[PDB]
């Protein structure tokens, strides 16, 4: 006598919020941006190729100085490249070989890396000796992790496959706050430039927004049919993109709380592996698992260019903090810096 | 007829029926090898970006074949003029050096590809099946160096030779001596012949014994390695057979009127052009085999 | 804690041969490079030798080339210096310094205690015109030393270092690459410069900062130090 | 190139040397994935060939190292983490079972990896286990051998 | 109480989350192009910079 009434209340709430959303959907981004001059054909060449890995590359991350990038792989080796010179700075061996993601502290002091072992171990780069030692092992996640990101040298936000994101404290090693709003597994994270909100792409085709201090779902976005496999904030911090298996990017907005514009092409019938914006929020690089990534436009869905220098699919990609270049870790154990 | 080259009694022959068969076949060989090797090099260097260890050897074979095909037009021009090299002395020695060097390189790289397939199929767990690109490039450079080391003597031995009213620029003459050149030709056929035959037989036997003939594409692989061996034998057998026959006609009797040489001498050079058909057929079978 | 204890020396006849066993107890050794810094009695520092990581690079000073050898024993964490034909000017104190090279590293971070050696009896040149600066605590003092050639490189960083040698103590790093600060030093120290004119500024003098300041270049070997400048209360 | 940059390059070269040594050492290993119902003697056959996270088993048989990753430890959704195990020589199956078989037989990422099937109680290979584990280990080693033949033939372009 | 508590939490979330404060699609689009045009010069990918300033070179 209670389930039916609450379910009907939830249905009514969904209907009224969807009507409120549709109320301000009078305009579309395409006709707004039809007047502005398109960028045109963009040619991005593989400036450098970092080799030394011997297995599929699952993730990478640039440092804040945008010169060092740490890349993980199946062989259980964590490598801190020097993008400018393509010479190693460190080569950290991992306890397990199933690392799905890496990270990088904003100060550059600490490095994190996690995977199927349900641990996001934080490494201590600048120690008194010349070897990188594990500094902590954050346990408490029921399932596997997929993205742990560093707020600062002392706060890290994880995102595990047990439908749960947590905010840990490094010295204590325990989660101060827990974010339990998702139903499916979580596959992405993007800390906002002001480091106050983040959006995680779940398996239920819904991406939620949270508050790092409160611990509640501020907003919730739908519009996909398959699991969301990528997430990337707009440089201003008011928009984010969603990459899903349905071969279609989807730009959202925090203030509007609605889809803003779609990115679809029929010739691509393969899913999305990772999405990364540019410095100015104009080019939406999206890496599909059809063995080549391509460059889009954030305003008029113009497939400006394609990065097709990779033997296998592009798994993870990222952009520098100064916008000078992008890199694409692929499944042939190659990192390529495109500029 | 009779002539002396470096205090060596030889019997050259400038006859007819050489400007009848050899230039028509050589021209078509050149105009087909150009297209085949150009497409192979286009699909290798530009249109594809993936360098595996076997692909480096295949690219080396393609480079050797392309250089030989480029050299072929000068051969066509030479045989058109009825054995009259109208180019010079440096180009003649350079051309002979290139001919010998890329013929030996094509044979050596064919042997290397066959050995690589033998290791892939019969000895799947050996180290040579997962070598690095550095080692493969070093091996390629070493094989090229071996080829040049075996042909500097052709590069240095002689220049175009005046005879009658014209000049001849050739290294495959017939003389009453067994130098390193003819022995090197016999070796560059026989030893790779043995290696290729052993590798192909072992590949066939292992694939059939391990119960693999059921698979579809493996049957195509077996038939393609078989036709590779067959075409190698067909292309390189008449030349060595005529060489052995002229050697026998040389040791028994020999240095005589030498007209008896001519009946088989015309048989030699024609079959020599047949070897260039090998360079034409490798693109068909080697690179053009991806399903 | 990090330590580098060396041994040997004490009395040598001219033309002899001795051995110094510099040992780093309980820390990484194969990753770090090591140099040999010799200090003549009541004189400045002078670079002697340097063996890289994996013994793939070995460099000697031009004045000891062919007479000195430097070797390392990684499994037992030891560093060796074989001297041949020990002249009269080789009597000095010999230190052991660690130096690890990578992007963002701080070479010459730690210095050994030093064992004295007694004997019975071109390159970048860097000058410190000032010798003694008697300054009471509380007021900033500027120490400057100039290089013959500009230490700046096409990369954009200048390889000039500053060391503080407290009386009766081993020198320690406090400024690497003319601008940065070694870990474990107060923020009051700060340096600057451009090309050839280098300066060091201390916010305020303490009781424990008294000592002698050295500056050394590191673009290419040999690495010439500078005549130390002493400051007193 | 200054002294610091050259020494950094030397350190990087030593790093590549160590990485290449480790890669050559670990290349001879072969990875296997254990997948099945979980209560049909999977642990039994695992211990037969033996003589949080995912259970890992290691053993050598004949100049070749086998790594056997048991997935029964984690009960999460099978499809979501299937993207990590896309590159594996083979999957050993020990006999919802029919649905699991149908799902794994037509996986997009498993269109090249063969499946090894065991009956205790792409090409698919089957075997009936006996008391002597030597026959079963021979069968699995042989099947991995044909997988390696296929991979090498594809690499060389013959396949 | 599992279903009851689940529905209670769902009611709480779908009640407070709602749609609090909202803008026009035109307004958000104008903000986006304003941000893009205010930073079009400082985006090296949008305007391919000359090799002299570029830190990646052969
Ligand atoms: C370029 C004119 C040379 C003519 C004789 N000759 C030779 O001296 N060496 C050869 O390899 C060869 N091949 C063919 Cl056909 N003719 C050959």
């Amino acid at each position: 006598s209670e389930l039916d009434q609450l379910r009907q209340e939830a249905e009514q709430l969904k209907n009224q919020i969807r009507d409120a959303r549709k109320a301000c959907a009078d305009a579309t981004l395409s006709q707004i941006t039809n007047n502005i001059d398109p960028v045109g054909r963009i040619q991005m060449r593989t400036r450098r190729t970092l080799r030394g890995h011997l297995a599929k590359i699952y993730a990478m991350h640039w440092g804040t100085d945008s010169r060092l990038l740490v890349s993980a792989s199946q062989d259980g080796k964590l490598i801190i490249w020097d993008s400018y010179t393509t010479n190693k700075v460190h080569a950290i061996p991992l306890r397990s070989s199933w690392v799905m993601t890496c990270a990088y502290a904003p100060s550059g002091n600490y490095v994190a890396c996690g995977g199927l072992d349900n641990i996001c171990s934080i490494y201590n780069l600048k120690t008194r000796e010349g070897n990188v030692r594990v500094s902590r092992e954050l346990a408490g996640h029921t399932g596997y992790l997929s993205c742990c990101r560093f707020l600062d040298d002392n706060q890290i936000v994880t995102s595990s496959g047990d439908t749960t994101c947590a905010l840990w404290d490094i010295e204590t090693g325990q989660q101060t706050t827990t974010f339990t709003g998702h139903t499916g597994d979580v596959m992405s994270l993007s800390l906002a430039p002001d480091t106050r909100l983040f959006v995680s792409g779940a398996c239920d085709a819904s991406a939620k927004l949270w508050d790092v201090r409160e611990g509640m779902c501020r907003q919730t976005f739908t519009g996909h049919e398959s699991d969301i496999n990528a997430i990337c904030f707009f440089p201003n911090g008011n928009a984010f993109a969603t990459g899903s298996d349905d071969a279609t990017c989807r730009l959202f907005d925090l203030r509007a709380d609605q889809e803003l514009m779609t990115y679809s092409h029929d010739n691509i019938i393969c899913g999305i592996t990772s999405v990364s914006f540019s410095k100015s929020g104009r080019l939406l690089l999206a890496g599909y698992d059809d063995f080549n990534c391509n460059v889009w436009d954030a305003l008029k869905a113009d497939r400006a260019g394609v990065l097709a220098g990779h033997d296998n699919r592009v798994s993870c990609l990222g952009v520098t903090d100064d916008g000078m270049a992008v890199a694409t870790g692929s499944w042939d154990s190659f990192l390529k810096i495109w500029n | 007829h009779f002539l002396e080259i470096d205090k060596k009694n030889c019997c050259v022959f400038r006859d007819d029926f050489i400007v009848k068969v050899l230039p028509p076949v050589l021209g078509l060989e050149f105009i087909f090898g150009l297209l085949g090797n150009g497409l192979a090099l286009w699909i290798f260097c530009f249109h594809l970006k993936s360098w595996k260890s076997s692909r480096i050897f295949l690219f080396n074979l393609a480079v050797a074949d392309f250089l030989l095909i480029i050299c072929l037009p000068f051969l066509m021009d030479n045989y058109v003029r009825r054995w009259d090299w109208k180019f010079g002395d440096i180009p003649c020695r350079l051309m002979l050096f290139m001919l010998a060097m890329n013929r030996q390189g094509s044979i050596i790289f064919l042997t290397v590809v066959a050995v690589d397939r033998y290791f892939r199929v019969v000895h799947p767990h050996h180290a040579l099946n997962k070598i690095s690109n550095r080692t493969a490039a070093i091996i390629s450079c070493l094989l090229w160096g071996i080829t040049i080391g075996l042909t500097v003597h052709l590069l240095k031995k002689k220049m175009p030779i005046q005879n009658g009213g014209a000049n001849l620029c050739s290294s495959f003459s017939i003389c009453h001596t067994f130098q390193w050149h003819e022995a090197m030709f016999l070796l560059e056929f026989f030893l790779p012949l043995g290696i290729i035959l052993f590798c192909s037989a072992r590949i066939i036997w292992s694939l059939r014994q391990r119960q693999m003939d059921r698979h579809a594409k493996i049957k195509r692989a077996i038939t393609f390695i078989m036709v590779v061996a067959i075409v190698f034998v067909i292309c390189f057998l008449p030349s060595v057979v005529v060489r052995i026959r002229i050697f026998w006609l040389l040791h028994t009797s020999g240095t005589q009127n030498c007209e008896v040489y001519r009946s088989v001498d015309l048989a030699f050079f024609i079959t020599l052009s047949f070897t260039y058909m090998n360079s034409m057929l490798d693109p068909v079978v080697y690179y053009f085999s991806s399903p | 804690d990090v330590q580098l204890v060396e041994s040997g020396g004490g009395l040598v006849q001219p033309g002899g041969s001795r051995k110094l066993s510099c040992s780093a107890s309980g820390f990484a050794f194969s990753s770090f490079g090591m140099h040999w810094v010799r200090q003549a009695p009541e004189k400045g520092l002078e670079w002697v030798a340097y063996i890289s990581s994996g013994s793939g690079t070995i460099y000697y000073a031009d004045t000891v080339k062919g007479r000195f050898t430097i070797s390392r024993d990684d499994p037992k964490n030891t560093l060796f210096l074989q001297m041949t034909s020990l002249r009269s000017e080789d009597t000095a104190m010999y230190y052991c310094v660690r130096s690890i090279y990578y992007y963002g590293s701080s070479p010459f971070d730690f210095w050994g205690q030093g064992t004295t050696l007694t004997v019975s009896s071109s390159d970048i040149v860097m000058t410190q015109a000032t010798s003694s600066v008697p300054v009471t605590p509380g007021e900033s003092v500027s120490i400057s030393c100039r290089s013959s050639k500009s230490l700046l490189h096409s990369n954009g960083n200048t390889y000039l270092y500053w060391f503080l040698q407290r009386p009766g103590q081993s020198p320690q790093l406090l400024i690497y690459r003319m601008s940065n600060l070694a870990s474990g030093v107060p923020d009051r120290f700060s340096g600057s410069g451009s090309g050839t004119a280098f300066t060091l500024t201390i916010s305020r003098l303490e009781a424990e900062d008294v000592g002698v300041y050295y500056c050394m270049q590191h673009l290419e070997y040999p690495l010439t130090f500078g005549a130390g400048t002493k400051l007193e209360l | 190139l200054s002294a610091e940059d050259k020494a950094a390059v030397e350190r990087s070269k030593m790093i590549d040397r160590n990485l290449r040594e480790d890669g050559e050492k670990a290349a001879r290993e072969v990875k296997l994935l254990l997948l099945g119902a979980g209560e049909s003697g999977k642990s039994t056959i695992v211990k037969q060939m033996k003589i949080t996270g995912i259970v890992e088993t290691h053993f050598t048989f004949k100049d070749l190292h086998f790594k056997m990753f048991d997935v029964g430890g984690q009960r999460s959704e099978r499809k979501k983490w299937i993207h990590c195990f896309e590159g594996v020589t083979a999957i050993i199956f020990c006999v919802e079972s029919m649905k699991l078989f149908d799902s794994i037989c037509n996986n997009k990422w498993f269109t090249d990896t063969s499946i090894i099937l065991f009956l205790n109680k792409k090409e698919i290979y089957t075997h009936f286990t006996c008391a002597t584990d030597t026959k079963n280990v021979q069968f699995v080693f042989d099947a991995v051998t044909d997988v390696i033949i296929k991979n090498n033939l594809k690499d060389c372009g013959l396949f | 109480t599992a279903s009851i508590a689940q529905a209670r939490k769902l009611v709480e979330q779908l009640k407070m989350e709602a749609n609090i404060d909202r803008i026009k699609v035109s307004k958000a689009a104008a903000d986006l192009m304003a941000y893009c045009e205010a930073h079009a010069k400082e985006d090296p990918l949008l305007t391919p910079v000359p090799a002299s300033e570029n830190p990646f070179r052969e």
Side-chain angles (χ1 to χ4, degrees), chain A, chain B residues 1-6 8-10 12-14 16 18-19 21-47 49-51 53-75 78-85 87-97 99-157 159-177 179-216 218-257 259-261 263-291, chain C, chain D, chain E:
Chain A
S1 68
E2 206 160 21
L3 186 56
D4 293 329
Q5 172 59 39
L6 293 153
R7 190 184 298 169
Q8 288 144 350
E9 175 68 33
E11 292 299 322
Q12 166 256 336
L13 287 156
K14 284 172 72 61
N15 220 5
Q16 54 91 9
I17 62 161
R18 105 177 60 189
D19 295 332
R21 272 174 152 202
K22 272 187 58 178
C24 65
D26 274 11
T28 82
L29 180 53
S30 278
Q31 53 65 20
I32 298 295
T33 46
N34 253 38
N35 50 1
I36 67 157
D37 167 36
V39 51
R41 169 56 64 138
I42 308 191
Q43 197 233 349
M44 311 195 68
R45 64 180 72 261
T46 179
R47 240 86 164 173
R48 283 176 215 283
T49 303
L50 303 114
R51 90 192 63 244
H53 268 315
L54 58 100
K56 304 167 234 151
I57 286 166
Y58 282 140
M60 60 76 84
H61 216 249
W62 294 84
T64 325
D65 57 72
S66 73
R67 201 191 164 148
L68 306 97
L69 54 98
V70 53
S71 79
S73 147
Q74 280 259 97
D75 43 10
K77 280 277 183 312
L78 210 57
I79 290 185
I80 301 163
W81 307 91
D82 184 27
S83 69
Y84 286 12
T85 318
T86 65
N87 77 272
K88 279 96 167 160
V89 176
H90 288 103
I92 310 151
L94 306 151
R95 287 182 79 261
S96 100
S97 100
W98 301 120
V99 280
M100 272 175 167
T101 172
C102 87
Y104 218 145
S107 65
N109 273 16
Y110 283 39
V111 158
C113 190
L116 260 298
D117 41 41
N118 315 349
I119 209 76
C120 171
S121 50
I122 303 116
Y123 289 92
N124 187 8
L125 287 198
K126 310 174 161 329
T127 178
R128 201 74 212 282
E129 294 82 329
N131 53 348
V132 202
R133 283 183 278 95
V134 199
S135 148
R136 200 72 73 189
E137 300 144 280
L138 319 172
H141 273 319
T142 303
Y144 72 107
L145 278 77
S146 204
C147 261
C148 45
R149 280 275 203 272
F150 264 116
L151 259 73
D152 79 79
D153 260 22
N154 217 338
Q155 283 164 93
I156 191 174
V157 168
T158 36
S159 95
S160 49
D162 64 337
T163 87
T164 282
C165 313
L167 163 72
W168 311 66
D169 184 17
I170 301 315
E171 60 275 10
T172 73
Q174 43 94 30
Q175 38 210 285
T176 84
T177 321
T178 177
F179 308 88
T180 88
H182 272 323
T183 43
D185 316 337
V186 190
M187 321 195 157
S188 275
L189 271 195
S190 277
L191 267 289
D194 59 345
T195 76
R196 279 284 94 92
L197 321 171
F198 60 97
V199 277
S200 81
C203 272
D204 41 48
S206 74
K208 283 173 161 278
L209 202 151
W210 272 285
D211 196 350
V212 304
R213 214 94 52 80
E214 309 313 307
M216 57 65 97
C217 159
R218 169 167 306 215
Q219 319 191 9
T220 308
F221 309 80
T222 78
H224 288 274
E225 61 285 40
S226 39
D227 38 356
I228 294 181
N229 242 324
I231 272 296
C232 169
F233 250 96
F234 209 68
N236 82 325
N238 285 274
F240 68 97
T242 39
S244 48
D245 294 53
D246 52 76
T248 279
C249 299
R250 210 144 255 133
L251 211 165
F252 285 77
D253 194 321
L254 325 188
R255 295 179 292 168
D257 187 344
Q258 198 134 23
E259 169 156 28
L260 247 193
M261 168 148 167
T262 177
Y263 301 84
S264 81
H265 270 56
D266 315 328
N267 50 354
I268 287 133
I269 187 43
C270 311
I272 297 161
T273 47
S274 270
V275 162
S276 78
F277 258 102
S278 162
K279 184 48 190 296
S280 61
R282 180 59 185 281
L283 301 168
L284 182 130
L285 284 100
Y288 314 87
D289 50 67
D290 67 2
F291 296 76
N292 59 324
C293 165
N294 44 73
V295 184
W296 294 62
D297 296 352
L299 306 164
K300 24 166 100 158
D302 268 3
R303 210 231 59 242
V306 178
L307 320 183
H310 279 290
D311 159 3
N312 231 308
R313 80 176 52 166
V314 279
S315 67
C316 207
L317 68 142
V319 78
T320 84
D321 291 43
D322 80 43
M324 181 95 58
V326 312
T328 41
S330 43
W331 279 16
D332 43 338
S333 89
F334 284 111
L335 285 110
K336 300 219 163 106
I337 304 164
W338 308 81
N339 178 227
Chain B
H1 28 67
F2 330 113
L3 198 44
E4 179 269 292
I5 293 100
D6 308 22
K8 197 145 301 183
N9 36 16
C10 316
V12 317
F13 261 136
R14 265 202 38 209
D16 206 37
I18 326 183
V19 296
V21 50
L22 269 159
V25 52
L26 280 199
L28 84 83
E29 282 256 32
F30 170 65
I31 75 182
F32 279 29
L34 277 203
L35 318 172
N37 276 200
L39 183 51
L41 276 168
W42 180 14
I43 214 84
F44 262 62
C45 265
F46 300 168
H47 204 262
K49 30 176 196 55
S50 62
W51 255 25
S53 196
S54 201
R55 208 142 38 244
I56 330 169
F57 297 125
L58 287 197
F59 177 83
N60 259 294
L61 198 134
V63 155
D65 271 25
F66 191 89
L67 259 70
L68 181 52
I69 283 312
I70 296 305
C71 278
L72 199 37
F74 293 162
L75 281 101
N78 169 35
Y79 293 70
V80 154
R81 291 256 205 232
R82 220 184 97 194
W83 289 96
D84 179 72
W85 193 254
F87 279 44
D89 73 313
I90 271 290
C92 159
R93 312 168 82 197
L94 177 55
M95 193 53 36
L96 299 209
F97 161 80
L99 261 288
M101 171 265 268
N102 319 46
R103 207 149 51 209
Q104 194 131 3
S106 194
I107 298 180
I108 283 178
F109 283 126
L110 213 175
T111 288
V112 165
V113 172
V115 168
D116 179 26
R117 279 158 177 179
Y118 164 44
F119 273 130
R120 297 278 178 177
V121 166
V122 184
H123 285 24
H125 293 314
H126 208 67
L128 261 63
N129 286 305
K130 56 199 100 62
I131 74 197
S132 319
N133 270 252
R134 203 77 148 203
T135 77
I138 283 311
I139 291 185
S140 267
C141 262
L142 180 173
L143 294 163
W144 280 107
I146 273 179
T147 314
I148 326 284
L150 299 181
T151 86
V152 316
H153 72 67
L154 283 209
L155 184 64
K156 279 188 67 118
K157 146 275 301 173
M159 309 144 248
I161 283 314
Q162 203 44 30
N163 76 312
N167 71 314
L168 76 91
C169 165
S170 151
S171 52
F172 266 179
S173 202
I174 45 185
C175 309
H176 198 120
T177 325
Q179 316 144 71
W180 177 273
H181 194 2
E182 312 317 280
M184 161 285 268
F185 194 17
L186 256 67
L187 196 130
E188 82 165 69
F189 178 46
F190 266 32
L191 291 203
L193 178 60
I195 293 146
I196 290 180
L197 256 292
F198 179 44
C199 289
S200 283
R202 278 317 293 274
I203 286 162
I204 299 296
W205 195 51
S206 42
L207 281 168
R208 281 199 141 78
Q209 164 91 18
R210 214 189 311 286
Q211 184 94 20
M212 229 153 269
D213 36 358
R214 153 73 259 177
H215 297 192
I218 219 74
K219 184 45 173 92
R220 148 171 302 247
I222 274 176
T223 201
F224 270 71
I225 181 65
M226 246 177 69
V227 48
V228 152
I230 291 157
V231 71
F232 177 85
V233 159
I234 279 308
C235 261
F236 283 99
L237 199 32
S239 35
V240 71
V241 161
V242 177
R243 197 88 198 132
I244 295 155
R245 175 72 161 251
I246 191 71
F247 270 9
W248 187 64
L249 267 298
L250 204 148
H251 218 322
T252 89
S253 165
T255 36
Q256 203 74 320
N257 49 3
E259 193 71 27
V260 301
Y261 290 172
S263 161
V264 309
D265 184 307
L266 271 283
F268 190 16
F269 287 143
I270 288 170
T271 58
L272 249 188
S273 34
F274 252 103
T275 80
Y276 307 131
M277 175 128 72
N278 167 40
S279 86
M280 151 188 308
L281 302 214
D282 313 308
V284 177
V285 50
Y286 264 128
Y287 331 123
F288 294 169
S289 173
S290 91
Chain C
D1 68 304
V2 176
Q3 43 194 350
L4 270 148
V5 166
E6 42 258 15
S7 58
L11 203 30
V12 190
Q13 301 327 289
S17 292
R18 294 296 317 275
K19 191 186 208 55
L20 301 158
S21 266
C22 158
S23 72
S25 60
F27 307 99
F29 201 97
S30 311
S31 283
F32 287 7
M34 316 266 292
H35 310 256
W36 273 100
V37 195
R38 105 159 169 274
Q39 164 170 349
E42 310 68 32
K43 294 332 147 283
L45 308 175
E46 171 178 5
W47 177 74
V48 158
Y50 155 64
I51 184 178
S52 160
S53 46
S55 310
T57 288
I58 278 194
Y59 283 137
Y60 310 90
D62 316 317
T63 170
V64 277
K65 173 60 133 193
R67 308 204 293 111
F68 286 8
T69 87
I70 164 167
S71 61
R72 74 189 309 164
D73 154 23
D74 310 323
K76 218 163 312 170
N77 301 350
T78 40
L79 185 76
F80 310 121
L81 183 83
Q82 273 314 80
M83 312 158 210
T84 36
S85 289
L86 271 183
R87 310 235 299 254
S88 162
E89 47 91 6
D90 287 6
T91 167
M93 173 97 67
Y94 285 66
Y95 294 114
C96 211
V97 310
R98 67 181 227 196
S99 93
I100 169 66
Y101 294 101
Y102 57 92
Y103 170 73
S105 80
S106 92
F108 288 76
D109 209 321
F110 205 73
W111 285 51
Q113 268 331 313
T115 67
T116 180
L117 171 134
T118 314
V119 153
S120 195
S121 183
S122 314
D123 63 38
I124 285 91
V125 68
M126 172 160 352
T127 82
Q128 314 207 352
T130 313
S131 89
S132 163
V133 194
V135 173
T136 72
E139 52 269 30
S140 266
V141 47
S142 160
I143 307 175
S144 173
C145 84
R146 185 167 304 105
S147 148
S148 94
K149 107 183 306 207
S150 174
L151 304 202
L152 200 132
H153 198 275
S154 317
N155 317 339
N157 43 350
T158 77
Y159 315 94
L160 179 125
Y161 299 67
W162 289 101
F163 305 110
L164 167 88
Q165 188 187 39
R166 331 235 193 187
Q169 274 222 58
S170 74
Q172 67 142 331
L173 186 105
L174 66 171
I175 276 190
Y176 60 107
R177 292 194 201 82
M178 106 187 306
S179 40
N180 313 74
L181 284 182
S183 292
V185 313
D187 71 330
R188 62 161 163 285
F189 291 94
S190 206
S192 51
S194 266
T196 56
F198 314 83
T199 166
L200 201 150
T201 287
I202 319 86
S203 176
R204 56 216 70 204
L205 281 293
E206 311 315 280
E208 328 292 337
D209 155 49
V210 188
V212 186
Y213 286 75
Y214 301 93
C215 52
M216 70 150 286
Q217 91 89 357
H218 206 310
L219 288 134
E220 253 302 325
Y221 318 91
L223 326 179
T224 39
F225 281 67
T229 311
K230 50 201 68 52
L231 85 179
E232 50 266 55
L233 51 99
Chain D
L1 271 297
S2 34
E4 306 232 346
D5 260 295
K6 288 291 220 50
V9 170
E10 163 157 357
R11 165 196 178 88
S12 92
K13 292 279 267 310
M14 174 143 152
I15 293 315
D16 325 289
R17 170 156 322 130
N18 235 348
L19 275 166
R20 154 170 320 120
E21 285 174 17
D22 224 303
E24 297 315 283
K25 156 149 181 266
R28 84 161 51 261
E29 289 151 29
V30 157
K31 307 154 128 175
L32 254 62
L33 162 62
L34 178 73
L35 182 150
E39 284 267 327
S40 55
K42 235 154 55 175
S43 67
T44 321
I45 172 161
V46 152
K47 91 156 62 74
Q48 274 176 276
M49 36 209 161
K50 177 79 198 78
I51 294 168
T52 81
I54 39 173
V55 184
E56 163 169 315
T57 319
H58 101 111
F59 66 96
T60 49
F61 164 66
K62 178 195 324 293
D63 53 68
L64 193 88
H65 198 198
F66 280 141
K67 281 224 166 307
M68 252 206 85
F69 310 117
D70 188 5
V71 86
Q74 274 218 4
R75 281 312 300 167
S76 93
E77 196 176 339
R78 190 169 328 279
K79 171 186 315 298
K80 318 313 296 222
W81 49 254
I82 218 70
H83 83 100
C84 283
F85 300 109
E86 78 90 19
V88 182
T89 47
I91 319 94
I92 164 176
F93 220 129
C94 308
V95 173
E96 242 185 339
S97 159
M98 93 279 296
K99 268 151 183 258
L100 170 58
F101 168 66
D102 159 78
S103 59
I104 67 142
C105 87
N106 207 244
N107 230 298
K108 267 182 234 308
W109 332 119
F110 289 162
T111 49
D112 52 308
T113 81
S114 147
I115 307 110
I116 276 144
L117 161 44
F118 268 73
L119 303 187
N120 279 17
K121 311 299 276 186
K122 71 221 67 160
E123 281 86 340
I124 299 72
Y125 315 132
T126 326
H127 174 88
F128 293 82
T129 180
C130 48
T132 50
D133 291 331
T134 177
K135 314 289 183 310
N136 317 317
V137 182
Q138 203 54 0
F139 173 77
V140 71
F141 161 66
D142 274 41
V144 180
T145 283
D146 322 83
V147 152
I148 299 169
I149 310 309
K150 277 180 189 53
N151 297 358
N152 289 247
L153 278 187
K154 285 183 47 64
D155 182 334
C156 93
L158 249 184
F159 207 78
Chain E
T1 187
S3 320
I4 319 185
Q6 152 74 86
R8 280 185 288 238
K9 163 67 96 159
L10 213 54
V11 157
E12 298 201 51
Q13 196 196 98
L14 279 89
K15 265 198 322 214
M16 291 66 88
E17 173 235 352
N19 95 76
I20 319 165
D21 217 332
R22 264 181 50 260
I23 49 164
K24 179 100 192 69
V25 167
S26 324
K27 175 54 151 303
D31 251 339
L32 254 69
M33 345 172 276
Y35 188 41
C36 182
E37 79 157 73
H39 292 64
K41 173 57 217 95
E42 313 79 335
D43 180 311
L45 308 184
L46 209 54
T47 84
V49 278
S52 296
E53 163 295 323
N54 198 310
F56 296 99
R57 270 172 284 113
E58 292 277 334

